[PDB]
Design a protein around this nucleic acid. Structure first.
Ligand code: ADP
Ligand code: BEF
Ligand code: MG
Ligand code: ZN
Ligand code: ZN
Ligand code: ZN
Lengths: 43, 106, 65, 694
RNA sequence: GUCGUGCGUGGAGAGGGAACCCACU
C-alpha cells in the first residue's frame, strides 16, 4: 500500500501507524500505482 | 509502470510505431464487425514487458513487442524493422528499479 | 527524452537510426552532415529532427528511481 | 566506523557480483559450431598467463579469454561426450531485461525431474518443424539442426496441476528469438551446469576488492618471519612430527599472507595441514579448508574425526562442517555433512483452511531448518569443502568471515579455483601441494598452451621458493625407488623404518609382493562411441581374481575394510570395474574395496593399490594422457605397502617413460605375466599361454 | 582426446475573506 522513496520496499501500513520507513529513517513514504485497470490512447 | 516517462507519453510513442499491414484489407474495422472487447478478427494484440536488473539500463525496441492474438496465418501487425542492427525503433529506457508492463491493441 | 518516433514534417521513421547516428558520430568520428547523409536522410526535416534532438532520458535515468 | 563501512561494502561487492556480462558473452556462442574456439576472433587476443601482473585490470583482461575458452571447450565436451534427455516446452510471454530476453514456459514436473533441470543450468533450444514425435530425439538432432540458441535456467517454480514455470534467459541479438512465437513447441536439451563457471567469473571480477589482491598479482609471498627454535621443538614434540614439518608450520603460522608448503606424496602434507589447524586452534576463529577433489576433503574430514592435538599434547575434537551434498560426500563422513547436522538439530472452506495450515507448517519447518543451519555454521570452527563448493550461496548469505584459509593440493586447481575461497576476507592463506602431481583438469589443449593450466601455486613457487619437505613416511622404500630416482631425481629420503612397518603376511607369497608389474598377454580395450572412453574387461577380471585370491588366503587373518583401492585413468573403466566387482563379490566391495581415478584418487592413502592401464592394445600405438610423468607419479604414489600395475607390456613399451618403468621392474625382477584365470590350476589354458609367452 | 565439478528445495443531501507579488490583452 506504500513504498519508500529510497528503499523502494513495500510497507502495507495501516491507520494509526508511523509513516516512517522501517528500513531507513527517510519518511517520504510514496504510494504505488492503483491496481485498477488503466487505458491510454496515442491520440 | 514505474519508468521516469509518463503513461500517456509512452502510449503516444508506441502509437507511432509502424506495424505490418500487408493483409490490412483482410482485417476489418472494429466499429464495423459486431464484436466485444476488441476481438482479434478486427484488432491485433501485443504485450510489452521490460525492466533492468541492477545495471545496464534496458532499451526497449519494436522487436520487444510480441503478438498475443491469433492472426489466423495473416502476416499483419508484425513490427517493421529496417535498421542494419535490427534493433528497431527505440521506445524508452528502464532503470534497474523501473518496471514496465503494458498491453497494446492496434 | 527519446528521439521522436516519426518526423514531425513528413512522418519518416528516424528513431531506428538514432543509435546508428550516435555510433557513426563516435565510432567513425564523422561530421553531422556526412553521418546523416549516410543514414539515408535527404529532406532537411529529418536532418534537423535528428541533429536538434537532446537525450534527456539519459539525464533522467541518472537518478536512482 | 569508516573502515568498517568500507570493509562491509567490499564484502558485499565480492559476495554480490553481476553475472550479466558472462551470460551475454556465453550465449552469443553458437551451439552447432564445431571449433576449438568460441568465435572466429584473432588468436592474438589470447595471451599466456603473465608471471607478473601490473594491475588487477591486466589480470582480468588476461584471464577472461582463457576462462571463455575453457567454458567453450567444456560446453563442446558436454555436447559430444554427454547425452542428456531432450524435452519440449511451450513458449510464453517474453520480457526484455538488460541485454537479455526472459521466456516463461510450462513444463511437466516428471520431465523436469527426469532431466534434472535446476536453477543454475544451461540448455540449448531448437525449432524442428519436421521433427516426428515418434522419432527418437537426442543431441544428434540438435547437432544436425542449424537453429540452436543457448539459454540459462533462471528459476524453476511449480504451479498447480504438476506444471513447472521455467524461466529461460537468452541473448537478444540471437536470431532464434524470432522462432519463439507464443504457444510454439521448442525442443530444449540440457548441456552443462554453469555454477562453477559463474563462481569463477564472480571471483575474477571481485579479485580487485580482495585483501590479498596485491600479493596475488605480484605473486610475492610474505617474507619468512624468524621464530625461536624453542617453539619449533615444542610443536614437533607435541605433534610428533619431524624438524622440516615443524619449521614449515611455525613459519606459515607466524607470517601472514600466502604461505606455500611443497611436500611430495607421503611427506605428511595432510598431517602438516592438521598440525597447522591444531596449532591455530590452540593459539572465536573459524578456518576454511578447501581441496579441489572431494576425496581429499573426505580424507581430511576422516583424519580430523580422530581428533586434533594442541601444543600441550592434549587431543580435542572441534566441530567440523562439510559443505556438500550427501551423494558426493563419502558415506563414512556422512554424519559430518551439513545437511545431516541440520536434520539432527531439528529434523471447500475446510480444504482451504487445511491447505493454509499445511503451507504455514512448511514455512515454519523451512525457517527452523534455516535457523539450525545458521547455528551450525556459526558454532562450527572448521569448514572443510572443495574450491567450487567453498562459494556456496549459504556461506555468502550468512556473511561469516574466514581469517584462515587452507588450500590442499593447490597444484590440482587453476588460479581462479584457488582464489575462489579467498572472497571471504582471506587474510592468511596456506597452500599445500606438490608440482609433480597432476595439473588442473583442463579440457582445452589451447588453454594449457596459454599456461591456463598453470596453478597459482606453481607461479608462486617460481617467484619464490616455498617451504620444502624432503622426508616421506608413507611409501614403501622399494616402491619409492623408481619414482624418486626418475621423477624427483632423488631429494626424497625414506623413513627410518618404512620397510619394517610395511611388512605384510601376503608379501611372503610369490604372486603378491610389495611391488609387482602384471602383463596382460591378451587384452584389448573398446572405445565408447559417445564418451570416447576406453574400457577392457580383461584387467577387471584379473583384478577380481587377484582380490578373490587375497581374500581366500587371508579372509579372517587380516581385515581389508577400507584398505584396498583400484585406480583407473578412465571413468568408464572405473565404473565397469565397480559394477563387475559388485556383481562378483556383492556388498562387501562397498566397504572392503574402493574404486576411483588417478586424478580423483590424488591424496588418498590405501594399503593396497591396483593401477589399471586401460591402453592394453598395441595396435593403438598411443598411450594417451598417461604418457605424462605427472600421471604416472600420482598413480604410483598411492600405494603404501602393495602396488599392482595391470597393463600390456607391448603397448606400454612404446612410450619412453613406461619403457623405463618396465626396464626398472625387470631389473628388480618385479615383472609378472597375468591373463584370464592365471591363478587357477584348473584353467590349464592360462598356464599354456604363460608358458608359450615365456 | 576424454579428465573435475557445484547445489537440495438503499436512499440521501450542499456557505469562507482580506492583502501581497507577477504575467497577458
Ligand atoms: N613423524 C611421523 N611418524 C610416523 N608417521 C608419520 C609421520 N609423519 C607422517 N607420517 C605418516 O605419513 C603419512 C602421510 O600421508 P600424506 O603424505 O598426507 O598422503 P598424501 O600425500 O596422499 O596427502 C600419514 O599417513 C602418516 O601416517
Ligand atoms: F602429494 Be600427495 F599425493 F597428495
Ligand atoms: Mg595431503
Ligand atoms: Zn527506506
Ligand atoms: Zn471486432
Ligand atoms: Zn522528415
Amino acid at each position: 500500500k506504500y513504498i519508500c522513496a529510497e528503499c523502494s520496499s513495500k510497507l502495507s501500513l495501516s491507520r494509526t501507524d508511523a509513516v516512517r520507513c522501517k528500513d531507513c529513517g527517510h519518511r517520504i513514504l510514496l504510494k504505488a500505482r492503483t491496481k485498477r485497470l488503466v487505458q491510454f490512447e496515442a491520440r | 509502470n514505474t519508468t521516469v516517462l509518463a503513461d500517456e507519453f509512452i502510449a503516444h510513442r508506441l502509437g507511432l510505431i509502424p506495424l505490418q499491414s500487408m493483409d490490412i484489407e483482410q482485417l476489418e474495422y472494429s466499429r464495423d464487425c459486431f464484436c466485444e472487447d476488441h476481438c482479434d478478427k478486427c484488432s491485433v494484440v501485443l504485450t510489452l514487458q521490460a525492466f533492468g536488473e541492477s545495471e545496464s539500463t534496458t532499451n526497449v525496441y519494436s522487436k520487444d513487442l510480441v503478438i498475443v492474438s491469433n492472426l489466423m496465418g495473416r502476416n499483419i501487425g508484425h513490427p517493421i524493422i529496417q535498421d542494419k542492427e535490427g534493433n528497431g525503433v527505440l521506445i524508452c529506457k528502464l532503470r534497474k528499479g523501473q518496471e514496465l508492463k503494458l498491453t497494446c491493441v492496434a | 527524452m527519446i528521439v521522436p518516433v516519426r518526423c514531425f514534417s513528413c512522418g519518416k521513421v528516424v528513431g531506428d537510426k538514432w543509435e546508428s547516428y550516435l555510433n557513426l558520430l563516435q565510432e567513425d568520428e564523422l561530421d553531422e552532415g556526412t553521418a546523416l547523409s549516410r543514414l539515408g536522410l535527404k529532406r532537411y526535416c529529418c536532418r534537423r529532427m535528428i541533429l536538434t534532438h537532446v537525450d534527456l532520458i539519459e539525464k533522467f535515468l541518472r537518478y536512482n528511481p | 566506523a569508516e573502515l568498517a563501512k568500507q570493509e562491509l561494502e567490499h564484502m558485499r561487492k565480492r559476495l554480490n557480483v553481476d553475472m550479466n556480462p558472462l551470460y551475454e558473452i556465453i550465449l552469443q556462442w553458437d551451439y552447432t559450431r564445431n571449433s576449438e574456439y568460441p568465435d572466429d576472433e584473432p588468436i592474438g587476443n589470447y595471451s599466456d598467463v603473465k608471471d607478473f601482473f601490473n594491475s588487477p585490470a591486466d589480470y582480468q583482461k588476461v584471464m577472461k579469454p582463457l576462462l571463455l575458452l575453457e567454458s567453450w571447450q567444456g560446453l563442446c565436451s558436454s555436447r559430444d561426450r554427454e547425452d542428456y534427455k531432450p524435452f519440449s516446452i511451450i513458449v510464453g510471454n517474453r520480457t526484455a531485461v538488460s541485454d537479455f530476453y526472459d521466456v516463461y514456459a510450462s513444463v511437466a514436473k516428471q520431465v523436469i525431474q527426469d532431466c534434472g533441470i535446476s536453477e543454475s543450468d544451461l540448455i540449448v533450444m531448437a525449432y524442428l518443424p519436421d521433427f516426428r514425435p515418434d522419432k527418437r530425439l537426442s543431441s544428434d538432432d540438435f547437432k544436425k539442426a542449424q537453429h540452436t540458441c543457448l539459454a540459462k535456467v533462471r528459476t524453476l517454480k511449480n504451479t498447480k496441476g504438476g506444471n513447472v514455470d521455467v524461466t529461460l534467459r537468452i541473448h537478444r541479438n540471437h536470431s532464434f528469438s524470432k522462432f519463439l512465437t507464443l504457444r510454439s513447441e521448442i525442443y530444449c536439451v540440457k548441456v552443462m551446469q554453469m555454477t562453477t563457471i559463474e563462481r569463477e567469473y564472480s571471483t575474477l571480477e571481485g579479485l580487485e576488492y580482495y585483501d590479498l589482491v596485491g600479493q596475488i598479482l605480484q605473486a610475492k609471498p610474505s617474507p619468512p618471519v624468524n621464530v625461536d627454535a624453542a617453539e619449533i621443538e615444542t610443536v614437533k614434540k607435541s605433534y610428533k612430527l619431524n624438524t622440516s614439518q615443524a619449521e614449515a608450520i611455525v613459519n606459515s603460522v607466524s607470517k601472514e599472507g600466502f604461505s606455500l608448503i611443497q611436500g611430495p606424496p607421503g611427506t605428511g602434507k595432510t598431517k602438516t595441514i592438521l598440525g597447522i589447524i591444531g596449532y591455530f586452534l590452540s593459539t572465536k576463529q573459524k578456518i576454511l579448508i578447501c581441496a579441489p577433489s572431494n576425496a581429499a576433503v573426505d580424507e581430511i574430514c576422516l583424519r580430523l574425526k580422530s581428533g586434533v592435538y594442541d601444543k600441550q599434547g592434549h587431543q580435542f575434537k572441534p566441530q567440523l562442517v562439510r559443505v556438500g551434498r550427501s551423494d558426493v560426500v563419502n558415506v563414512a563422513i556422512k554424519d559430518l555433512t551439513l545437511e545431516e547436522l541440520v536434520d539432527k538439530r531439528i529434523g471447500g472452506r475446510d480444504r482451504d483452511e487445511m491447505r493454509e495450515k499445511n503451507s504455514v507448517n512448511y514455512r515454519n519447518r523451512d525457517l527452523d531448518r534455516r535457523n539450525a543451519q545458521a547455528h551450525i555454521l556459526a558454532v562450527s570452527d572448521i569448514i572443510c569443502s572443495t574450491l567450487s563448493g567453498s562459494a556456496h550461496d549459504v556461506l555468502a548469505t550468512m556473511g561469516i568471515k574466514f581469517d584462515t584459509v587452507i588450500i590442499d593440493e593447490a597444484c590440482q586447481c587453476t588460479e581462479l579455483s584457488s582464489i575462489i575461497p579467498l572472497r571471504y576476507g582471506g587474510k592468511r592463506c596456506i597452500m599445500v601441494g606438490d608440482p609433480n602431481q597432476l595439473p588442473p583438469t583442463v579440457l582445452s589443449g589451447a588453454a594449457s598452451n596459454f599456461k591456463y593450466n598453470q596453478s597459482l601455486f606453481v607461479r608462486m613457487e617460481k617467484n619464490s621458493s616455498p617451504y620444502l619437505l624432503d622426508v616421506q613416511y608413507r611409501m614403501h622404500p622399494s616402491i619409492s625407488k623408481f619414482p624418486s630416482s626418475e621423477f624427483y631425481q632423488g631429494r626424497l629420503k625414506d623413513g627410518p623404518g618404512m620397510d619394517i612397518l610395511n611388512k605384510r603376511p601376503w608379501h611372503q607369497l610369490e604372486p603378491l609382493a610389495p611391488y609387482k608389474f602384471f602383463d596382460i598377454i591378451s587384452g584389448r580395450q573398446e572405445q565408447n562411441a559417445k564418451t570416447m572412453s576406453y574400457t577392457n574387461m580383461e584387467e577387471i577380471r584379473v583384478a577380481i581374481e587377484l582380490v578373490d585370491y587375497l581374500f581366500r588366503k587371508f579372509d579372517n587373518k587380516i581385515d581389508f575394510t577400507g584398505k584396498i583401492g583400484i585406480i583407473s585413468p578412465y571413468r568408464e573403466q572405473m565404473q565397469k570395474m565397480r559394477k563387475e566387482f559388485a556383481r562378483y563379490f556383492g556388498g562387501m566391495i562397498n566397504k572392503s574395496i574402493d574404486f576411483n581415478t588417478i586424478d580423483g584418487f590424488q591424496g588418498q592413502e590405501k594399503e593396497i593399490i591396483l593401477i589399471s592401464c586401460v591402453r592394453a592394445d598395441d595396435t593403438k600405438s598411443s598411450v594417451g594422457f598417461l604418457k605424462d610423468f605427472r600421471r604416472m607419479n600420482v598413480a604410483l604414489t598411492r600405494a603404501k605397502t602393495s602396488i599392482w600395475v595391470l597393463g600390456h607390456q607391448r603397448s606400454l613399451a612404446k612410450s619412453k617413460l613406461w619403457r623405463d618403468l618396465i626396464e626398472d621392474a625387470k631389473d628388480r625382477s618385479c615383472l609378472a605375466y597375468a591373463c584370464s584365470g592365471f591363478l587357477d590350476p584348473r584353467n590349464n589354458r592360462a598356464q599354456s599361454i604363460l608358458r608359450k609367452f615365456n
